[PDB]
Amino acid sequence: PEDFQQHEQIRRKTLKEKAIPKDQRATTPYMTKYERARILGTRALQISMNAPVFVDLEGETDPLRIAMKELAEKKIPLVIRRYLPDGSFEDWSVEELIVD
Template identity: 85%
Template sequence: MIVESGVPEGDRPRTGKAAKANEVRVTTPYMTKYERARVLGTRALQISMNAPVLVPVEGESDPLEIALKELAAKKIPLVIRRYLPDNSFEDWKVEELIVQE
């Protein structure tokens, strides 16, 4: 699943430009607080709708807490799509990004 970042729904480019190659990424490798909130919310919703949990739960039942554990373990199976000013985009896997608590 791709979580899109940076461009409102109506302003998304309609062109078929491809993603930048992983070696020539221009955006920061740090997850922004907005991306973090979107990823955690998306993953918590998936968990609440009985998606498989990818970390040991250890009695935890709150989907947001489980999503936080998955983020700390870099186990969230999502991709963040960052749009660039030239209407291209970069896809980053959540496990590739550096998360600051």
């Protein structure tokens, strides 16, 4: 009631500190081959649990091959949280990157 007020004020301001917006972000505009892994895991890990599938899957049982059919059409609704070792981060959607 009063000391969680002195706990969410501190935290979300500290969470507001280390964000780097779309004009200040200067890391790589590529998908760095581990991003392509963990997307194709966790996107396929959602589709196994009856998450909505934004592609016309045509007789595919593997969540992995289904998730590689959404990445080929830039359909995956994930946002990559690229940390920097000070603690800061830059937020990157799947749509604005280039899959090699």
